[PDB]
Amino acid sequence: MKGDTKVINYLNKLLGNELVAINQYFLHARMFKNWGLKRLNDVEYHESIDEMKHADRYIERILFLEGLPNLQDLGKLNIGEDVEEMLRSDLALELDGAKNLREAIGYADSVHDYVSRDMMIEILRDEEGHIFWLETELDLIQKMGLQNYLQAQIREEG
Amino acid sequence: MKGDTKVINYLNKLLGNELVAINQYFLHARMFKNWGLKRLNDVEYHESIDEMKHADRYIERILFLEGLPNLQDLGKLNIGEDVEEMLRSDLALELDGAKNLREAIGYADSVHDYVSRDMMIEILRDEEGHIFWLETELDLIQKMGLQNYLQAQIREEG
Amino acid sequence: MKGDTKVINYLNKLLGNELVAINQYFLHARMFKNWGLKRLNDVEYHESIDEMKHADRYIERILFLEGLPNLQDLGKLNIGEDVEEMLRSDLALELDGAKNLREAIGYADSVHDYVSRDMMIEILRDEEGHIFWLETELDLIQKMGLQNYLQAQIREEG
Amino acid sequence: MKGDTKVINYLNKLLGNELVAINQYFLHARMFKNWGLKRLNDVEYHESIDEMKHADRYIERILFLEGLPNLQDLGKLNIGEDVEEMLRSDLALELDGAKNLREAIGYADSVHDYVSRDMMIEILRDEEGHIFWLETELDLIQKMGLQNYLQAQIREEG
Amino acid sequence: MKGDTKVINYLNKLLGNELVAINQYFLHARMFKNWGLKRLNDVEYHESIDEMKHADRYIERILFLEGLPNLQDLGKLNIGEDVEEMLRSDLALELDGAKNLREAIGYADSVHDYVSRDMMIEILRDEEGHIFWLETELDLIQKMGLQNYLQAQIREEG
Amino acid sequence: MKGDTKVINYLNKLLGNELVAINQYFLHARMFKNWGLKRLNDVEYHESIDEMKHADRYIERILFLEGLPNLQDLGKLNIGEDVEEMLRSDLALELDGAKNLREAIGYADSVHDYVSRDMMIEILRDEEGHIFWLETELDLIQKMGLQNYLQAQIREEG
Amino acid sequence: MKGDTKVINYLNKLLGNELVAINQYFLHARMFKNWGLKRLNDVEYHESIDEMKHADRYIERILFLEGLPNLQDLGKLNIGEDVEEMLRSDLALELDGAKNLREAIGYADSVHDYVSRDMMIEILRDEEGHIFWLETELDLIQKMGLQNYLQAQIREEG
């Protein structure tokens, strides 16, 4: 079903955001894992998987709307070197991504692509949940100190 | 069954205490939650629920005794800005409420409303249990230091 | 995550509405219960519980957006003296609340806070379901007469 | 298998009756439901479903006999404005349809289409069961009065 | 609850679209069945059922909003004579309907009927899923040829 | 444990191959899905997942050996436009990847990194299995013709 | 089956390494246990058991190849006096052992004793897993501090 050209462009831009997040979160997860921070590995790895699910939704929607998914261009990753820097990088990435989503959601509404909009709002809802988690962790590092914080990550939280 | 007017006035005063506590504990709970202090959220939230149950008992008793439950007047909340201030505020609230409960229990006995008294003694027993928990938590903050204390709250206890 | 100030003000206004409904529905329920109208107590009590859930959603959303939930100011309750007056009062409360919600949902859209909007639309949907029930019960009082209507409430509808 | 042309015309006429009943009973059901008359909604909705099953049998039979099912022409609905008027309209509809069925069954026998006849007699048996329920309900409205009658519909009849 | 008059008119127009689709899909289904194309009968029949569910939602919403559901006027059916023509007819119907849905969704938003809007968006999401299926099947007819396509329909897919 | 620098360079090169395959196979998969070729979607999607697992093994091994995983550089994808072209592109990618693996396996042996070698041989064994599947499917397209081949993909194989 | 004499000498040397590790890890384990460091006792004890399993494989392989297993000569143990020193001693022991293993694996290949080689690669894979754990724990001591580190060992991890 032929979709709006600019909606398809937005979907490819958002897909682009997801491809960056997938790689950044996956590497951060395994860096966490390599440092023995099992709890952070677990959360970060599942964020990575969650972004794959988002990318999948963008890809299928683009194909349905008869556009061409772009998995070729990969934006800049920002891999941190310590736990706080890594989480702060994820947070900045999520905030950038949420700005893009808001714009796309607004535009999709204006050209009456309510199904694309509905999908993006669900994804945005997922992203704000991740933003909440990040902000909380970043504050906890300051509140309990880095040594306690790292100690709180070495066992899985199940 | 027409009750003693002053007993009903006491029950409305105690109900008023409960209405303040319900709101104060519920907001403190979600503030804890927003900070990632899942254990404190869990306890604080269930205290709020417990105060709803106490309010319910007062409301039903007042109606049975043919009085008019007053849910319209809401006393002063004292919302804290950090964990210790919030727990100290809850404790002061509990101690004030216990003073009121003691007065009512004495008065109900004097006019032979033993069923109202029996109800209030159970509630007082619940409140001293809460007072015990608060005093213990406040002492632990001092004994293990705030950083260790916050760390001990980020996972649910169960 | 720093939210829009006017959205946060809307959320606090809506929270204020919920705090009124919680108390109004709770007292109405126990009045129904005190009269032996078990069916009405059951529905009314669970509406009270449902408004607590709505308040909870507003409170968590406000805290996330870094605003201050206001549980201190309690609006006017309108407690009825007979079944029809109580239900009509609940209905007026719901209709007033729905106007406020519609306005907030519109504005949330205009500043691209689609997650707050999504939350509020779910709540509005709950409220219109409650309005449907109220309108139905009020009509049934007139159609079967008050004596039959009351008789129909004295046993639980499981 | 090439059927009798006039038999096919009868089946299309009967299908036409079913299409009317489907819509009339479906709307009547949801009007009942909207008024809180759950028992009537339940029965009326299932009659609508049963008329769909009848329509289905006609459609399949017509196609087998190599005729063209007519779903395009929709006869007059008679939507009532109150419960008694709605049930009396359903009853008149059933009686008109039973007349049509009797004529078709007689003709089908006459041209030796015994399988179409057998199908139609099963449907006629279903309809007389519905006519029985309607006559009963209409009599009960008079015998117990409308207020009692409506009270008896507000709960599901297990 | 008195709704917006034009929203109600939209809902009746959409209900009208559904009434056409119910009949068109039901007849197409049984034509498929009569040809031995069991897989197409199964999908097409369940589309008809799905459109009945959509109609039900419109009817109940209209009644809640105190309007009058119109089940009397039936728009033009376009019954195909071979498989490709039938599927293309369904597809044109779905596309026409999606246009109406988009228009209604935009208008409901403008008068703050967010619950009617939310219902319609769910329905639009369903229809685009049906549009996807239709486009796929039509392409498969071209890609594998009609003889292979028909062979692929004669057993149930499950 | 500080690894051999050139081994780490090989692992990053092989990771790079995996990153291309992950994206190429995922897009091909959903293209198959969009075409209704359910069997091909299922296989292609699971190949994509298998390459993610391989990438995961490289990333963890690089980190253990104290190198820096490179997820930033993404090589050329070769997305096909029809089924045969897509499978041939996958096959060329796999053959290129196997050449790189053979080189790396030889080199790792020469510097006594037997654990890296052992890991790569397992991965090579997986890739040759995929190569077998691709070559088989490509031959089958020619042997049964494209129309029969496409028909054989529209149902899941399980 | 008469084996290569030099391979057998390698197997006896590696067996000697295992005999040192078995005793060193067992004593470190019970020293940990005596200090109340239950998590470390658990891991260290199971490493000792794993080295017994490795020794067992060497002994059986040596006897099969018709050599004489040497369990008489025991190399130098390096028992640490505090947790960090003990772990660093284990790590140095593992690294020395891996050097010997790589050499033996290389030589087994040159004389085509591929089964001895295959056994040794599995053991090497085990040892690098142990090296990973050791490096991680040593880094965690510095990152969270010894006091937090010790606190993190007093309960079993399972």
Residue numbers in the entry:
A (entry chain F), B (entry chain C), C (entry chain D), D (entry chain A), E (entry chain B), F (entry chain E), ...: 1 to 158
From the paper:
Bacterioferritin (BFR)2 is a bacterial member of the ferritin family that is composed of 24 identical subunits and that is distinguished from the other members of this family by its ability to bind protoheme IX at 12 intersubunit sites. The subunits of BFR oligomerize to form a spherical structure (outer diameter ∼120 Å) with a hollow, central cavity (inner diameter ∼80 Å) such that the Met-52 residues of adjacent pairs of monomers coordinate the heme iron by means of bismethionine axial ligation. Each subunit of BFR possesses a dinuclear iron site (the ferroxidase center) that catalyzes the oxidation of Fe2+ to Fe3+ by dioxygen to endow the protein with its characteristic ferroxidase activity. The three-dimensional structure of BFR reveals the occurrence of eight 3-fold symmetry channels, six 4-fold symmetry channels, and 24 B-type channels, all of which are potential routes of iron entry.
Crystals of the D132F variant were grown under conditions reported previously for crystallization of the apo form of the wild-type protein, and the structure was solved to 2.0 Å resolution by molecular replacement. Replacement of B-type channel residues with phenylalanine identified the D132F variant as having significantly decreased Phase 2 and 3 iron oxidation activities. The structure of the D132F variant confirms that the D132F substitution does not significantly change the overall structure of BFR or, most importantly, that of the dinuclear site where Phase 2 iron oxidation occurs. The structural alignments establish that the metal-free dinuclear iron sites of the D132F variant are not significantly different from those in the wild-type structure except for the position of His-130, which is known to adopt alternate conformations. Using this probe radius, it can be seen that although the B-type channels in the wild-type structure could provide a passage for iron from bulk solvent to the inner core, replacement of Asp-132 with phenylalanine sterically impedes access via this channel, consistent with the slower rate of iron core growth observed for the Phase 3 kinetics of the variant. The position of residue 132 is critical for the blockage of the B-type channel in the D132F variant because the side chain is located at the constricting point of the channel. Substitution of Asp-132 with asparagine removes a negative charge without introducing steric hindrance and is insufficient to decrease iron oxidation rates substantially. This result confirms that the large decrease in iron oxidation activity exhibited by the D132F variant results from steric hindrance of the channel and not from elimination of the negative charge of the aspartyl residue. An important conclusion from the decrease in the Phase 2 iron oxidation rate for the D132F variant is that a significant amount of iron normally enters the central cavity of BFR before entering the dinuclear site where the Phase 2 reaction occurs.
